[PDB]
Amino acid sequence: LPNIYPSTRCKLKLLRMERIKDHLLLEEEFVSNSEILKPFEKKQEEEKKQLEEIRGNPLSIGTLEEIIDDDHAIVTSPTMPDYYVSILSFVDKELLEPGCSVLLHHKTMSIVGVLQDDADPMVSVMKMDKSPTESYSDIGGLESQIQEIKESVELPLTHPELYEEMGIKPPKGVILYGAPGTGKTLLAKAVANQTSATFLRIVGSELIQKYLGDGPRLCRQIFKVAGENAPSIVFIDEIDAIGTKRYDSNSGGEREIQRTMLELLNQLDGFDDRGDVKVIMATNKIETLDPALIRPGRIDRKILFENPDLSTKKKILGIHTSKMNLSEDVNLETLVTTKDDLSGADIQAMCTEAGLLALRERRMQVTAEDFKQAKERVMKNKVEENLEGLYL
Amino acid sequence: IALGEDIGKEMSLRHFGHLMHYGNEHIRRMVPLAMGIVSVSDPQMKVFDTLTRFSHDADLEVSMNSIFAMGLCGAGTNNARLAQLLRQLASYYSREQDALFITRLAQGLLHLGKGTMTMDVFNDAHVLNKVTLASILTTAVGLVSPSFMLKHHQLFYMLNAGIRPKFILALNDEGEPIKVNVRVGQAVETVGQAGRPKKITGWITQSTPVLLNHGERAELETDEYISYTSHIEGVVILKKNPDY
Amino acid sequence: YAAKLKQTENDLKDIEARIKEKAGSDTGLAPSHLWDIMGDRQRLGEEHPLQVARCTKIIKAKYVINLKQIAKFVVGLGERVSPTDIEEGMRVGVDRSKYNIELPLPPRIDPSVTMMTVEEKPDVTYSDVGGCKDQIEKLREVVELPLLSPERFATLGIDPPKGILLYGPPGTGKTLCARAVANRTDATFIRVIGSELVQKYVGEGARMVRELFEMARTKKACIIFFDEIDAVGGARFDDGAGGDNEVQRTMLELITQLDGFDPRGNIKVMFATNRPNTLDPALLRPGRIDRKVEFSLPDLEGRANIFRIHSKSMSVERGIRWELISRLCPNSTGAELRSVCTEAGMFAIRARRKVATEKDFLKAVDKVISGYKKFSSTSRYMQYN
Amino acid sequence: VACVPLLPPPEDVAFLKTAYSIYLSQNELTDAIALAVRLGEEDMIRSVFDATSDPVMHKQLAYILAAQKTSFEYEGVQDIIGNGKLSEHFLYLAKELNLTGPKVPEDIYKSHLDNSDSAQQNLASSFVNGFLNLGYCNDKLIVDNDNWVYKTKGDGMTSAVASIGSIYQWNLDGLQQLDKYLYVDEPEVKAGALLGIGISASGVHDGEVEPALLLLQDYVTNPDTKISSAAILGLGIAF
Amino acid sequence: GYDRALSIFSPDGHIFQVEYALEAVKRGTCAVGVKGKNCVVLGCERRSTLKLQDTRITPSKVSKIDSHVVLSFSGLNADSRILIEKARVEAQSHRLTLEDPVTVEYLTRYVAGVQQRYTQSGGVRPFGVSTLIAGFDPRDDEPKLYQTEPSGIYSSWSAQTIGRNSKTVREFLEKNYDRKEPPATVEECVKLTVRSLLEVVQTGAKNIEITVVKPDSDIVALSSEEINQYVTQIEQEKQEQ
Ligand SMILES: Nc1ncnc2c1ncn2[C@@H]1O[C@H](COP(=O)(O)OP(=O)(O)OP(=O)(O)O)[C@@H](O)[C@H]1O
Ligand SMILES: Nc1ncnc2c1ncn2[C@@H]1O[C@H](COP(=O)(O)OP(=O)(O)OP(=O)(O)O)[C@@H](O)[C@H]1O
Ligand SMILES: [Mg+2]
Ligand SMILES: [Mg+2]
């Protein structure tokens, strides 16, 4: 069924669903007449009866292993001795991918259907199923970075006309390197908000597995799942985790991490020539990354993130305190807009702390004293810096 | 008849599907053409997949009709996806030279005029280009027996009668093109909305002449350069409004 | 008028449900038909269930069959197979009841070794690769020429080299020059990523390589593209703790398969790596690797050819100075030139211009080569080479 | 205006006329010309024209109805309604979009990337080339290769020359190039050139004397079935 | 003792230590200098991260090498004053050896030479500083402004800026300064230098320090009460136009 315009009541709207019913009844009449003309003894719904009786019951479940001499196959059920099952006509010979789940017949054990996986026991967590929240309005400033990320990841998907006319393949990947707590994750949430593509997030820690084998296995599975659900906006985050840390649970140690990184650097570029799989990584330490990953042709536009300036600080204060039960005594102009160094995370942290403190007193309105107390609270809970002493 | 309101278009898609389900072999080799004429110059996603399904089917004439329906469906849009499908079919239907010839004709029609011209039957404001529909019907009437036009291929130039450019051109008052920002996005109807809602969704701030595909309108981003014609398609003339 | 709207909306669902019910996840296609009810004819023949089992010692005739885990029967033939068609190691379609050798089957191959066989020939050609004329010539003379025209090698009575390295800095064209070979060849092009040969359980990489080489030998002419062999390429070394000895085991199994107590059998193999330094000298030894290509950073003429190849498309303004652009980009791998072309195309889009000019290309090349210089790969990996 | 397609007739004409009356009283002729074209009443289009005193609106309505390919006769405007400025507009488009560089039919095929009767393949290539460089007035496959026509055999020679007229569509310049192939004694070549003559001026109508009609009318009465067929086909295409 | 080479030619041709010192300079405070007909002005900013830094004993960002030539730096402050000490002792030695007050060109050549030697000698990392040298030669009224890079390359600039966000100040000077028509007054030079600074400093009138160099052994340091005086009319003329 199609969509319906307009939203409100209108005679033309009634005409539209009148056309809908007219065409629907006309399809129904055509199908009825066609069926009645057909020889029911081999037509109508007797095909369902024949399919059910030939299929037999119950249909067992096994695993396909080969398609040699089509109309023949070697299934391998977990308990059966790997029969030489023949392939029937009802099954579609295009979904019989070696390694699928076929439906053997109970007694004669002839394939009478392919059971699609449709499980996604782990991907369901990965697959973005509900847009997080924040749109691009919630990001204060950062206009250049937003423009770059848009023209790299959004425009190729929503508006390919500019790129195909211009004759350039879109920039493959983007890495968001910058100082910690500066919106590198927020911008990913924003691009996930407005999207017509699947958004499979992954964090670099999860690629540091425990067993030797399941280091490249996970990456291969992730990129295969991204490929089949094209297009994909895979968001490998904390990509520096593979380099540092050196987890004890990792059995291989450094070597297994190296193999996993090699598999990643292949799957990003590949001999396989994957389709529309955009890659967006973000990290705090761009330094400790093997330059194979960040090489052009794998991730082209390396967007730099920088701590906000005074105007950006005041814009962040305005956007974050927009949903405030603020008393007039609070002055946003001198609130945190002090030029004594802040970050994109501090401005929200002090707001959260002040809101919690106001909740503690059960004051539904926010006082300037509470905002100042949360300001100093955030200031003390801050590892200041180290390299400034060189230039101090 | 269904080639009017797009709701009739979408219903006719299912109509042709059902008829293809229960149809005799003479009517089998037109359901592709039925999709093509109905969905010309707008390569919608749900149109060409069933056409691809029927392209690998038997009744070689059905396959020829399916690929020609692709060609009509992708008329001038330069759709790389449908171009890849057509190239794949060229690889497959290479033994039968007639299929190869009609495949190459569909390839040529796919990228007609390098993408600056289309077979669109009905333009903005739903005017009817009777010449374009006449040409399409002329090329589709007798191709239930495609061997006829394989013999007499001179009628394949009939598309040149209903062919037209598809572009914007901000002509100055004197009669010369002038650069101006043109807002291009997906068309939306103004029926139930109140006030002054926008007629464009997903705007692109594009400059002077662009190529708006089937399903997009145009509107002047700049406050100045007042267009005498409200419907910004085809040739457009502008005047300098003194404001700003 | 909503009194009309109510049943107007109701009819939609009612009629669609009626149509779905009247017309009637796991099947083929009823509209395609092809699911004829003649399957009873191919169904009454209860010979379709055939136990699979690997044959064994051929008792001079009686056959010993080793049904996976049901039994270890000793069985005769089934009159449908010639007595000389069964040999030890073959898989037999043993009959279910009153077991018999009915149908020999192809040797068991691991599924995970099956999808590593490209049937989707990639979209590149030898025209794409530029600035590597001599290297592409050597790659041709090793891989393509022996299969295309083997008569000359018979006239000279020589064996063309079987095995070729593709060392070089990253993003130089190695994978590109293998994809071009895959497109322009007529033989099977089994691809192997280095990390795929690292399984979990001990000794599984050796089985991986053995089954892969058996599959390759099954075909008349095959090309193997062992890639990122840096993964399974560790030089033999001892540290007391037996570090990553499984990868070493897989590597020695590969080395034995390439040249052991049995000839290879027309299995021309292409390797590719970005750090050839860490390869065991046994692999570098000729016999398993004959020619060692040197994909390196292109020169000025190479840069001009790269720009021409990657700018065959694009609405470039006529009169652009490609020589000047190539000169103002020293020691940059071809991937960086491709990125320069992409960014030059992009900068025109942001300014809404439909044609990118020289002033745009200069800005793009400055931004890419100079701005993105700290994140460059061609300066560390050059030392490894 | 959206009521017309769905609303049951004959009230559709009443809706069109009422909307036309609304638009005329408000001097918004931009939509009014479109509703007039929907109705098809020529006197109604004339009344739209008499409601305008500014020449620029006359030119713009002329452009709209020329895009609609409707032959409404008006003095001082006949060039625009005759689609005579379409060729210059299209060559300006080609210059601005940098699409002047012609594309080979092989470039469309890309058979070089996908690879390990000659007459029919030449016919297909000619059709592809004619569709590609339509209106750009420049090509390298056929314009510079006269022996190219001879590769096609039988009816293929006709479409070969017709591709030149297709490339020179909307341009009266192409008549010179098509003229030379008219002198070839082969009836198929004459028919192909004569058919391409109409396409070279298809949808183009000067106010006084169409050259395509003058050159075309002589060959209609030719006893050859092929030549007369091409003549009538070109007459239908041009007008 | 330490003989190991620290500056090694990279496979792409650059020296990694020198090009790292370029970035080390890129993180320093912005310092800008312009010259008029007979006046050269060295403008500089200060760090605003920490407060409660007095003015009297705080080391001046612009250090006096001699009575006629002054130096300003950017980048690592630790290493720069070593170059200052070496330049001062070399200037005194030049006075002893040639009986002539030092010239801007010779001092800049010496500074470039010592930075080059440290890029050459083994066991020593290159300086992480970039210096600006301004002053007047003896018996000459022409202001000379010189920039010295850690790589050892020195050049004359009619107006140059170094440090963080130096690109913005460079492009600003590229359009609000004319090389062929320099400002004719000390006030105009100071106004241009100040207006250049607010493009980056974005408040911080307290920690904006400006040194004005004049011929005939005249070097002055404008105090805050004059810098804010200039800032007053500069911000007055900014928003209203
Ligand atoms: N410009 C901004 N506008 C709005 N919110 C911002 C901005 N910059 C930072 N924030 C806020 O900072 C919070 C914490 O920062 P965020 O998680 O985005 O940083 P990150 O650097 O990506 O993270 P991490 O360093 O932990 O990987 C976010 O929840 C976001 O709301
Ligand atoms: N000579 C060349 N001709 C054409 N394109 C080239 C050339 N050299 C490099 N390129 C471009 O750069 C890339 C070639 O490198 P590719 O992506 O195949 O990776 P690689 O060199 O195998 O990488 P790694 O060594 O990290 O595995 C392609 O995207 C290609 O377009
Ligand atoms: Mg983060
Ligand atoms: Mg590679």
Side-chain angles (χ1 to χ4, degrees), chain A residues 200-212:
Chain A
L200 326 186
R201 179 202 262 122
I202 198 64
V203 183
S205 149
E206 327 163 72
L207 303 183
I208 304 183
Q209 300 277 76
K210 164 181 321 171
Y211 286 166
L212 289 212

Side-chain angles (χ1 to χ4, degrees), chain E:
Chain E
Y2 205 18
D3 216 337
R4 149 169 322 283
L6 266 308
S7 34
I8 306 301
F9 260 109
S10 62
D12 62 358
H14 324 108
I15 319 171
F16 274 156
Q17 289 332 285
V18 153
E19 158 288 342
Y20 285 165
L22 291 203
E23 262 75 351
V25 152
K26 203 73 42 72
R27 211 172 267 129
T29 87
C30 174
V32 67
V34 299
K35 45 156 87 192
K37 327 279 190 195
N38 72 116
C39 176
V40 79
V41 170
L42 279 176
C44 91
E45 74 186 350
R46 318 196 262 197
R47 188 59 39 71
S48 160
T49 297
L50 278 176
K51 273 321 114 182
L52 302 182
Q53 310 119 326
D54 73 79
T55 315
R56 47 223 189 81
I57 56 181
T58 294
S60 177
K61 323 305 152 281
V62 183
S63 324
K64 221 191 198 278
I65 310 205
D66 205 356
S67 177
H68 62 284
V69 46
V70 87
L71 186 138
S72 161
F73 79 94
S74 176
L76 278 156
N77 42 34
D79 312 37
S80 69
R81 27 184 89 74
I82 287 96
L83 283 187
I84 289 159
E85 203 51 45
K86 305 192 83 83
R88 290 173 178 173
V89 64
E90 163 291 338
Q92 292 301 318
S93 176
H94 173 278
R95 202 170 293 282
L96 267 38
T97 314
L98 300 193
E99 212 168 349
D100 159 52
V102 297
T103 65
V104 190
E105 157 82 4
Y106 186 73
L107 183 141
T108 285
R109 266 218 316 283
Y110 183 80
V111 168
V114 56
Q115 287 193 162
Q116 158 68 17
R117 164 191 310 81
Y118 273 10
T119 59
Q120 267 302 91
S121 325
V124 43
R125 64 176 175 81
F127 275 115
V129 322
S130 173
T131 41
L132 295 181
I133 304 99
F136 298 88
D137 318 61
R139 87 223 83 183
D140 170 40
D141 65 336
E142 176 51 42
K144 308 305 293 288
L145 180 57
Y146 269 171
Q147 175 195 2
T148 280
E149 233 71 12
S151 166
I153 295 175
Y154 81 88
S155 67
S156 169
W157 289 93
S158 296
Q160 184 53 265
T161 177
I162 47 185
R164 58 180 175 191
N165 318 94
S166 167
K167 316 308 196 165
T168 302
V169 188
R170 269 233 314 284
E171 54 86 13
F172 188 60
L173 270 290
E174 278 276 357
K175 53 198 59 195
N176 323 55
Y177 170 83
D178 186 0
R179 191 171 73 84
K180 83 152 184 295
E181 299 307 314
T185 58
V186 179
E187 171 100 17
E188 206 146 353
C189 281
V190 169
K191 188 161 43 178
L192 174 58
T193 295
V194 171
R195 190 123 57 72
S196 295
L197 282 201
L198 288 312
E199 313 307 318
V200 48
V201 65
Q202 64 112 47
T203 53
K206 331 282 198 178
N207 45 28
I208 286 180
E209 187 175 3
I210 292 164
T211 301
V212 165
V213 181
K214 291 308 289 168
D216 283 340
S217 180
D218 196 344
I219 291 171
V220 316
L222 309 186
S223 77
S224 59
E225 66 94 18
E226 333 191 90
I227 300 314
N228 51 48
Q229 187 267 351
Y230 304 117
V231 164
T232 302
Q233 91 266 5
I234 273 184
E235 59 86 20
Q236 161 267 311
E237 289 170 347
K238 185 170 183 175
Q239 92 292 11
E240 290 173 348
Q241 284 55 42

Side-chain angles (χ1 to χ4, degrees), chain D:
Chain D
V1 301
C3 299
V4 182
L6 305 98
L7 166 143
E11 302 183 2
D12 48 2
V13 185
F15 254 79
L16 286 152
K17 281 176 177 178
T18 314
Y20 166 80
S21 82
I22 305 151
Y23 270 120
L24 262 206
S25 74
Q26 299 275 342
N27 308 295
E28 259 211 359
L29 320 92
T30 90
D31 319 5
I33 179 76
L35 301 104
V37 172
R38 275 199 203 177
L39 279 139
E41 294 217 359
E42 293 180 8
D43 43 1
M44 157 140 40
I45 306 169
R46 193 80 58 160
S47 55
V48 180
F49 269 97
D50 319 310
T52 283
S53 59
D54 172 48
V56 197
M57 327 217 66
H58 292 119
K59 329 163 183 171
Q60 236 192 353
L61 299 173
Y63 276 119
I64 280 175
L65 64 94
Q68 298 327 290
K69 302 188 168 191
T70 315
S71 49
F72 167 88
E73 289 188 348
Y74 178 38
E75 298 86 315
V77 153
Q78 197 76 21
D79 169 36
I80 304 174
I81 63 193
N83 228 21
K85 210 67 185 213
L86 184 75
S87 97
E88 166 265 3
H89 287 336
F90 193 71
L91 51 66
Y92 168 81
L93 243 197
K95 164 217 279 175
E96 284 293 334
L97 289 180
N98 216 280
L99 296 174
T100 62
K103 314 192 60 155
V104 193
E106 186 43 51
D107 183 292
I108 271 286
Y109 300 151
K110 299 158 277 291
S111 66
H112 39 282
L113 77 79
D114 263 357
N115 236 29
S116 60
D117 193 4
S118 185
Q120 182 82 333
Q121 89 159 111
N122 290 329
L123 196 50
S125 299
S126 46
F127 258 110
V128 167
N129 181 26
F131 278 149
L132 283 200
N133 299 320
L134 193 146
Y136 304 110
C137 311
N138 283 69
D139 185 55
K140 335 156 290 289
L141 185 137
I142 172 155
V143 179
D144 320 284
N145 186 7
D146 303 346
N147 290 333
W148 147 251
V149 190
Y150 299 102
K151 308 163 49 178
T152 60
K153 304 313 286 212
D155 37 24
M157 322 198 80
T158 72
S159 297
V161 196
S163 73
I164 313 175
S166 88
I167 291 157
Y168 287 119
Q169 181 173 350
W170 310 319
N171 195 355
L172 289 324
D173 155 76
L175 276 90
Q176 304 181 23
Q177 286 69 18
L178 308 181
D179 187 31
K180 307 315 290 174
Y181 302 92
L182 176 56
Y183 296 68
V184 156
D185 302 317
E186 289 196 348
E188 289 166 335
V189 172
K190 281 194 185 182
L194 159 78
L195 180 141
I197 282 296
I199 302 161
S200 60
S202 89
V204 175
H205 303 304
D206 65 331
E208 297 196 355
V209 275
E210 286 207 29
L213 188 64
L214 264 58
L215 301 176
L216 241 192
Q217 65 188 0
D218 282 351
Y219 296 79
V220 193
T221 60
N222 270 324
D224 283 337
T225 60
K226 307 191 182 197
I227 297 185
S228 55
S229 69
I232 60 200
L233 215 61
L235 280 157
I237 288 165
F239 303 87

